[PDB]
Structure 1
Amino acid sequence: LRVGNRYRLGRKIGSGSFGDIYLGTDIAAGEEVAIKLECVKPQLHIESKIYKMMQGGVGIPTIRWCGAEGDYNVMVMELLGPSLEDLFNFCSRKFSLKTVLLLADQMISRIEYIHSKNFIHRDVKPDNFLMGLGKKGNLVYIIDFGLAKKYRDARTHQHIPYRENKNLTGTARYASINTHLGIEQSRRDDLESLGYVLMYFNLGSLPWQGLKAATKRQKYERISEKKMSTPIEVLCKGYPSEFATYLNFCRSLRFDDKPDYSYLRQLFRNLFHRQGFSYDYVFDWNMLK
């Protein structure tokens, strides 16, 4: 089907927060793009806005067209590549310390960027980080803002109030410990989750992973119990102390606190330089023959 006048809808690729993604072609421009279709019978437009607000940031997919099409709502964005999870599998589930640091530098910046635009992601995990293709193939992109919400006012930089008794709201494997306590989620939570993702890449899997549970409720309860019984020092044993520093710093932040993104990045950059690596964007998978 021909959509938005210049786009050609192709076969389905996968799916987003609440909608199905297709590989399409910007016929006039000759570029592959990704197209999400949302029944006029709702999240596309809520995202389009959060997406056109993030416009311009590195690692933020571009929105090329937004419109109605007969019985569908249409959004077109640049076609991105494999998620970090797909690539991790592709590398026999092993990432060198250099790949982990290269990703960490970019990932921390992405989260900083979003927070500067008054939003907190709330669902930071490996599948929501994809590399770019072609000219953007060396860049880590972040997706799925279905759970993203404003945490502070544009003008009075007034921070959302503090509140507890809230149900879990993302993946429980990478959720921050306070998310598990019903505490409202803020900037510190996005960074803590990124933190688990990093150790997740170094270990191959987290200690609260693959637990044994008869019911769904008991599995979530076990994950939370385990993530609270595992000290950061035990989680990070055998790996550069910097990963532990990052995690303790995150967990320590105060609800409305502003993270020191620079310190966190430098934490890793100093280690990176001590190891003698260069920020050459040469990841493990780039070495696959």
Structure 2
Amino acid sequence: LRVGNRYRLGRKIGSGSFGDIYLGTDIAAGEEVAIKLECVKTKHPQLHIESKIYKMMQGGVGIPTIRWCGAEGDYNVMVMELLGPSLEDLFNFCSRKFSLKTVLLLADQMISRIEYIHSKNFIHRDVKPDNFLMGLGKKGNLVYIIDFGLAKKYRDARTHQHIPYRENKNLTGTARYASINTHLGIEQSRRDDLESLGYVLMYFNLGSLPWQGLKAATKRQKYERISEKKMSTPIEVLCKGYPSEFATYLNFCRSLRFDDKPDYSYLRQLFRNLFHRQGFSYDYVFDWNMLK
């Protein structure tokens, strides 16, 4: 159909939290775009709140620019620059195995995306492979983070007073990568986004995490098995057979206090120093860049 006068809606290409995503074209500008559609109906107006978070993040490296936010017909609509494959997509394309060089070159950009989001007072709360997409064209090797649907403010804009420590919370994000404290129902904070990143990295190293594939009955008790397996698996076991850097990262993350400012530079240095020890070149070539 025809959306926002300027765009043409294409076919469905995916979903995000709170809405369906479609391919499209900005006819007036000759640009291909991604369009997220949310009913202006029900109970919850998430597309509009999320849109303000993106704009607050506009300008940062690897944050998708929003071209138009508006409502039309039955939908609130947000138009975004088209982006490439997600890290999960690429992981599959690479036979579900990434070389250490690629893992380290991904960790570098991923830690910075999280630091950027945190610098603007928000926590993502759903760090996972599918929420990271590569750019296109000149930005083909830039890793973008998307979906602020479950994002939340962790400190006051003006005073920077951190939100209060809270318990008995239900899980928000993906169980597979959620932090231990998140499973324990503790309010998520900066440390939590980083811990999750730690699991995503080890996920890329192993092909799967040890708490994956557990069978249960409820669809709520599987999170209990997930949580128990996660707690029962010491870091040294999870990372056995990989550079010590990964366990040091996870250990660092679990040691942070609820309102602590993470040392993002130190985390990136662990990986850069490892990048050097392994002898890898600084050509920034990712595994998939070699697909012949």
So what's the TM-score if we normalise by structure 2? 0.96
Q: For 1:227-283, what per-residue CA distance to the aligned partner results, in whole angstroms no more than 9, with x for missing partners? A: 001000110110000001100000000000010000000000000012122332211
Tell me the equivalent position of 2:16.
16
- Kept in 2, the 8 Å contact 1:83–1:127? The answer is yes
- Kept in 2, the 8 Å contact 1:118–1:152? The answer is yes
Unmatched 5+ stretches in structure 1: none
Query: Aligned pair 1:230/2:245, yes or no?
Result: no
CA apart distance, 1:215: 2.6
Q: Give the Cα–Cα distance (whole angstroms) in 1 for the partners of residues 234 and 126 of structure 2.
A: 23
The one of 39, 64, 67 equivalent to 1:64 is 67
CA apart distance, 1:158: 0.5
Q: For 1:163-189, what per-residue CA distance to the aligned partner results, in whole angstroms no more than 9, with x for missing partners? A: 111111111110100001111110000
Unmatched 5+ stretches in structure 2: none
- Kept in 2, the 8 Å contact 1:232–1:244? The answer is yes
Q: For 1:40-76, what per-residue CA distance to the aligned partner results, in whole angstroms no more than 9, with x for missing partners? A: 2x21111110010000111111100111212221210
- Kept in 2, the 8 Å contact 1:102–1:279? The answer is no
Q: For 1:210-237, what per-residue CA distance to the aligned partner results, in whole angstroms no more than 9, with x for missing partners? A: 1121332221110100000100011011
CA apart distance, 1:28: 1.8
Q: Give the Cα–Cα distance (whole angstroms) in 2 for the partners of residues 108 and 247 of structure 1.
A: 13
Q: Give the Cα–Cα distance (whole angstroms) in 1 for the partners of residues 281 and 193 of structure 2.
A: 27
Identity %: 100
Tell me the equivalent position of 1:221.
224
- Kept in 2, the 8 Å contact 1:63–1:78? The answer is yes
Q: For 1:77-125, what per-residue CA distance to the aligned partner results, in whole angstroms no more than 9, with x for missing partners? A: 0111111011101111010000000100000000000000000000101
Q: Give the Cα–Cα distance (whole angstroms) in 2 for the partners of residues 230 and 251 of structure 1.
A: 14
- 1:12 counterpart SS class: strand
Q: Give the Cα–Cα distance (whole angstroms) in 1 for the partners of residues 149 and 276 of structure 2.
A: 37
Answer with 277-286 or 57-66: which moved more: 277-286
Q: Give the Cα–Cα distance (whole angstroms) in 1 for the partners of residues 220 and 74 of structure 2.
A: 38
Q: Give the Cα–Cα distance (whole angstroms) in 1 for the partners of residues 70 and 226 of structure 2.
A: 42
CA apart distance, 1:288: 1.0
Q: Give the Cα–Cα distance (whole angstroms) in 2 for the partners of residues 86 and 33 of structure 1.
A: 19
CA apart distance, 1:137: 1.2
So what's the TM-score if we normalise by structure 1? 0.97
Q: Give the Cα–Cα distance (whole angstroms) in 2 for the partners of residues 168 and 3 of structure 1.
A: 35
Answer with 206-215 or 142-151: which moved more: 206-215
